[PDB]
Design a binder for these strands. Structure first.
Lengths: 91, 104, 99, 82, 95, 107, 80, 99
DNA sequence: ATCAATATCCACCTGCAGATTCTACCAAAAGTGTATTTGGAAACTGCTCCATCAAAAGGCATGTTCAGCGGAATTCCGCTGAACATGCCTTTTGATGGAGCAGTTTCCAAATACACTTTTGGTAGAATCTGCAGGTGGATATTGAT
DNA sequence: ATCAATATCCACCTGCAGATTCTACCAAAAGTGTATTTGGAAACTGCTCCATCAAAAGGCATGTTCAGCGGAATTCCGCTGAACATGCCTTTTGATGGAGCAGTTTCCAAATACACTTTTGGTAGAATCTGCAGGTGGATATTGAT
């Protein structure tokens, strides 16, 4: 299992004519997983420093803030909220 | 329809959702969670490939290799900080020589 | 008569070179034996995926290189351009490895 | 029989690493010091690494063994499956 | 009013088993408590990781042990394992 | 006349509590019976190591109540503990007595 | 007065002393304050973020502790 | 009448003294003020448990006191006995916080 | 060497703040006994990938010569931090309304859970493609001598 | 400065290893869809414990003076960098045997999951109790001047 096809879609969106060597995709793959565990981790803690049994979108979001630098977070929050709202406003 | 299309995303909402559960981070995972985290995840890979991609371009290259990822990261204050304790194999270092060291 | 570059011209030339590339710099095989030596005078009858030796090596060079930058910074702090043992040592002290 | 392999880390190799690191001048005494410092770095990464191996009841150190070891030490590697 | 658990009563027990005539300031006790929670967290955390690496569902003494080996300095690790094992052996041999 | 696991493992620490926390800790899906016990044994033990050292500390101060300074001196003066707690700060502990020789009066 | 200047020279002097320093360049104090400012900005930001996550208006000892722990400056004596 | 200790004697006396004790050395209220002010840029109308300020204070001094030990080392490496801005700068660089 | 100013240390003293011993009410643990479920050891084994040996060649490590320059030691201003005694402004301490942090209670949206149905993203694998690594020779630096 | 020695640059060229390209299979995913459970938002509340206004306290700001430190200059010389020779060992390309990782079906010690019952650790409130911090005195060690 891996994020490679997904990295690849995204990749084609920013740089339509650019490719990625496996060695890079490999690093890309590592990168995604790392970020994932960090976010998930801060979420884990957050949730239970509050005697909450659930990690919701709200924990992920505080986590994104606790973990990312300034502009990147201003931007992740944005995309994240955007997605949730779109996911919800459907079905 | 997949939950990603429902969420406007290229990263796998359902896979991330599965992953959150096996990571056993909490007794339960609301549906909003994997959606949001798959966004942030896709958002960040977008930023680093956007910047890697140019490094490859600045080097008369078409295929991104680790060196471009490294260039991309170390040359951006935020990614460089987010990634401050991370080693990107085969990446090299940024060209940088202290002044006192140059000819006179 | 024979051409002769002044001490340091080549050195700067090598920084430019090496900093411009990313191949490993420690002999491959030599390093592997060190790995097998340290590992074994630690637990016998062990084995290695070649990638595990390779990860050890990428990790090491990246540590060592990152260490020399700090060392280089320490020497300069002392108004020198030549790194010395105590520089490496001050850097690891401040880094926590000692202290 | 393995012995003195620390001497495989040759002057030239240790000099290139210093160059990548931006260093123009090196004292004669740096090399022995560097091998000292590398030997410790290796022992630290490998003790853990092999501890992961044993745990898992395998005879072969996997790269993940190393990848986990490096992550325990706060020296996260990317490119080998994590 | 929701309780507020802490190891203080055990710390104190253990204390007296070691220095029966010594007492511990309150602020001291609070540190010992933080010390325990931290260690707890650290060992459990490593243990968790260990299980996930090995696609295992259960954290056992096995994990606590490897975890301790990874978390503690040599000798400390050594005793910690000794004690560790004493405890499980004794607990088993008993009705 | 039920007996507690802590008494069975023969320990002062809450073998049951540790077990409780381990489950609530979201660390794993399941928790072996012996981990709670082992881990408890390990906690207790480290506890004993610091109070013993910290206790001496107080003797050496002609004091009988252990305060933070006593735990801080106990720690940073033990290679192993100090390493283990090397990214930890003990409130109210101060720092070990120490002056770079070069800063001393020329005798 | 300004608050950061509220951290005075004699206090910075006392700190230094505790760190075993004997002679102190005059330009240190200002340089020091900026380091303390940046220190507290980093911690507080995370503590206060924890605060909000819990919907409160009081930074709690714990919220500082959780913060120091993320910053990697684990503190003992206040729960965390 | 005339006494006067020579430069360094009282400094020394003070080091001995302060390495003995453990009280905080920054005055509470100004500190409390500084904290409150910094925080006021993060969220408004905040209140702070007395413990949270006390924990934060306790954490900053231990930080600064330690940064003082690496600075002092950096100054001595430069064969000085007077710490300087650059000395702090160099320690924070090797520590991983710097520019 | 000699006082002279001071700091430091030590034995003793005692009030008190904080540590201790008491009594006890109790929901949350923690232990017990039963019933059900399942993680992951053990035994057989398909199969990958690790250790190994094999041979050749050339990229490198080694070892030397040699002299340039950088590190170390010494001298020496002059400026800048330390000591100090001086004057009083802020910090500290302490008594007090009120704003929340918490304890409880309610119920509806949202999360499990198990059952099917369906779509996808790994992959074994032969086939086809393509960026560029590595070679080249000729145009522009860049160095170092004079 | 003009100038020979050399390293550096950079676009043109091409066999090649590593990337892209279906074709096919399919277990595991991810989705659809009722059915059951429940977590935590949400509102009301009470009681801490926090921000605040006053007053007793005890540093910090301040300006002077000078000692000693840092750094500029200067110099001796020893070690490090550059260039060169020789030839060893790493690198490269294969191929082979087999160890040990990893897939699978199997089956039970150990785990979970109610439910009944015993009890223990935390809170609160009072009353009693004590280690020590600071406060004195007086001896003596340290520092600095002569």
């Amino acid at each position: 299992e891996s994020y490679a096809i997904y990295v690849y879609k995204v990749l084609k969106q920013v740089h339509p004519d650019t490719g990625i060597s496996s060695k890079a995709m490999s690093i890309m793959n590592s990168f995604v997983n790392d970020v994932f565990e960090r976010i998930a981790g801060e979420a884990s803690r957050l949730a239970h420093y509050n005697k909450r049994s659930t990690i919701t979108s709200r924990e992920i979001q505080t986590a994104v803030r606790l973990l990312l630098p300034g502009e990147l977070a201003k931007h992740a929050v944005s995309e994240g909220t955007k997605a949730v709202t779109k996911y919800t406003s459907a079905k | 329809k997949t939950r990603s299309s429902r969420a406007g995303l290229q990263f796998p909402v359902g896979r991330v959702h599965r992953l959150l559960r096996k990571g056993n981070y909490a007794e339960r995972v609301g549906a909003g969670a994997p959606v949001y985290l798959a966004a942030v995840l896709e958002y960040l890979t977008a930023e680093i490939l956007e910047l890697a991609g140019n490094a490859a371009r600045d080097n008369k290259k078409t295929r991104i290799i680790p060196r471009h990822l490294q260039l991309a990261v170390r040359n951006d204050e935020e990614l460089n900080k987010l990634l401050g304790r991370v080693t990107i194999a085969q990446g090299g270092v940024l060209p940088n020589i202290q002044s006192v060291l140059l000819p006179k | 008569k024979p051409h002769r570059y002044r001490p340091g011209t080549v050195a700067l030339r090598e920084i430019r070179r090496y900093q411009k590339s990313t191949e490993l710099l420690i002999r491959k095989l030599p390093f592997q034996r060190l790995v097998r030596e340290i590992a074994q005078d630690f637990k016998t009858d062990l084995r290695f995926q070649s990638s595990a030796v390779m990860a050890l090596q990428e990790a090491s060079e990246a540590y060592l290189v990152a260490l020399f930058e700090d060392t280089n910074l320490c020497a300069i702090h002392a108004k020198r351009v030549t790194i010395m043992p105590k520089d490496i040592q001050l850097a690891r002290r401040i880094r926590g490895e000692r202290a | 029989v393995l012995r003195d392999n620390i001497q495989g880390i040759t002057k030239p190799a240790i000099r290139r690493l210093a160059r990548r690191g931006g260093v123009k001048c090196i004292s004669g005494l740096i090399y022995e010091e560097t091998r000292g410092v590398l030997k410790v770095f290796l022992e630290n990464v490998i003790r853990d690494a092999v501890t992961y191996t044993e745990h898992a009841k395998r005879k072969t150190v996997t790269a993940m063994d190393v990848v986990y070891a490096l992550k325990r030490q706060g020296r996260t590697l990317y490119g080998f499956g994590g």
